[PDB]
Amino acid sequence: SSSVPSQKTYQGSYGFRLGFLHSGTAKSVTCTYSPALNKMFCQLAKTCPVQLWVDSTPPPGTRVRAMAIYKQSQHMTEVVRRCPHHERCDGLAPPQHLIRVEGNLRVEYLDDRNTFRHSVVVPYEPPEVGSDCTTIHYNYMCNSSCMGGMNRRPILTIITLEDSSGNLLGRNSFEVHVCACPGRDRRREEENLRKKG
Amino acid sequence: SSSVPSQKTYQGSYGFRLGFLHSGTAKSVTCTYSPALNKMFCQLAKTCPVQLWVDSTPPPGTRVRAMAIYKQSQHMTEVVRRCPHHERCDGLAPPQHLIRVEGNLRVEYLDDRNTFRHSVVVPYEPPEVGSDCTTIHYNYMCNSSCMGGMNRRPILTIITLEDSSGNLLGRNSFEVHVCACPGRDRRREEENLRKKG
DNA sequence: CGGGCATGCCC
DNA sequence: CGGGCATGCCC
Ligand SMILES: [Zn+2]
Ligand SMILES: [Zn+2]
C-alpha cells in the first residue's frame, strides 16, 4: 500500500482551475464532461482535452503534473496502474502508466521511488495572446472496467501546478470513467444522481 | 498462426468415450454438463471431473492428453492461452497453460515446439475392479470471457488416448464455457437451442 | 450510429 | 443462494 497524495482542491494565489470542452450527443462520443458530477467520461487511448485557466501568470519553469488515484476510501492506498493485458499491448510512456500526454516534446513520465505512483508532467505554457486558457491532451490507456487494473473502480485525475522548486501552486481534480460508450454512461449517471442521489 | 489438431471424434478399437457427472440445480454450480450441447459449463480453477470409458483395455504405457482449441473457424489457428492477468496471478503447471490436472503425480505439461500449443498429459489408469471408468480432475484457469485470453470465444477440449509410441488410439472432444455462473449459462444456452437453434 | 445481449459480480 | 446491474461489443 502507498501513501495517498492530496486531492483537496487548492485554486491558490494564481486562481488555477480546469475547463473542459462541450461534446456531441452520441452514445459513443470520444470524450464528454459532466459538470454536475465533476466527471470526465472518455474512451481509452483517445484524446481528452483539459484546459488550464489561471488569473495570474505562473512563474517561468512552472510544471503541470497529472496523476490518477482511486476515489473510494477502500482503494485509495492502491497504485493506479495499466492492466496486464494493455501493458503487454509511443516511445516515451512506460507501458505500465495509465495516463499519457500527446503532442508534447517535453513530456516526462515519473515513477515515485517512495510511493511507487505514476505521474506525467509537462511544462506550463501561458495561453497565446487573445486566448483564455492552455489545453493539454491526455490519454487514458485502460478502461475503468479493465480486469487486473482499475476493475470497475472509479478514479480521480489530480492536476497540480508546481513551480520548478517543487512548491504547490494549485491543485484541482476530476473523476474519470474510461469506457466504450461515454455518452451512454454519462447520461445514465446523471439520471441516477437526479433519481436517487 | 498455428496448424490445428483434429477434433474429429474417433472412438477407435478400444471403444473410447467420455462421461460426465450429474450436477445440482444451483445458478453457480461449480461444474455442469449439457448432453444436448456436448458442452461443459464450469467455474475457473475449480474441479471438472471427466470420466474415461473404454470397451477394451489399452496397452501398458498409454497416455491421456488434453488440449484446448478455439471452436470457431476464424479462431481455430490461434493458440489457446491464459490471459495476461491470470498468468501473472501449483508448482508444475506453467503460468501460461489454461488446462491443469489436479491430484496426479505423473502429470506432464507440454509446449509443442512446432505449433506452440499447450497440452497436459497423464498416464491412463484402468478402472478399479467393479468400477466402469477412470476419472481425471481438470481445472480451467481462465473464464471464457477473459480479456486478452479467450475473450468470449468458445473452446473445445480435445482428449486423446495415445499409446507410448505416439499412436492415436482414441479421440473425443467437448465444448467448454468457463464462467461465474455455470447453471445460469447452461440453462440459457439450452433454452436458446430449443427456441431458435 | 443507437438498440440490445452476455457475464462478472454487487459490499 | 438467486435477483439484477454495468459495460464491452455484436459480425
Ligand atoms: Zn486495460
Ligand atoms: Zn484469465
Numbering used by the authors:
A (entry chain A), B (entry chain A): 94 to 182, 186 to 293
Publication excerpt:
In the case of R273H and R273C, it was shown that the replacement of threonine by arginine at position 284 (T284R) restores activity to both p53 mutants. Crystal structures of p53 rescued proteins in complexes with DNA were obtained for three double mutants: R273H/T284R, R273C/T284R and R273C/S240R. The crystal structures of R273H/T284R-DNA and R273C/S240R-DNA (space group C2) are similar to that of type II complexes with contiguous half-sites. In the second case, two bases at the 3′-end of each strand (C-G) are extra-helical and the 5′-terminal C base of a symmetry-related strand completes the consensus half-site to form a contiguous 20-bp binding site. The loss of protein–DNA contacts as a result of the primary mutations, R273H or R273C, is compensated for by a new interaction between the side chain of T284R with the same DNA phosphate oxygen shown to interact with R273 in the wt p53-DNA complex. In the two rescued complexes, the arginine side chains of the suppressor mutations, T284R and S240R, protrude from opposite directions toward the DNA, each forming a single interaction with the same phosphate group, but with different non-esterified oxygen atoms. The directed interactions of the R273 amino acids with the DNA backbone appear to support the local constriction of the double helix prompted by the two Hoogsteen base pairs, whereas the weaker interactions via T284R or S240R appear incapable of supporting this change, thus retaining a continuously regular double helix with Watson–Crick base pairs. In type II complexes of R273H/T284R and R273C/S240R, R248 side chains form direct or water-mediated H-bonds with the adenine N3 atoms, respectively. In the current structures, however, as a result of the Watson–Crick geometry of the A/T base pairs, the corresponding minor-groove regions are shallower, and their associated electrostatic potential is less negative, resulting in a relatively smaller contribution to complex stabilization through electrostatic interactions.
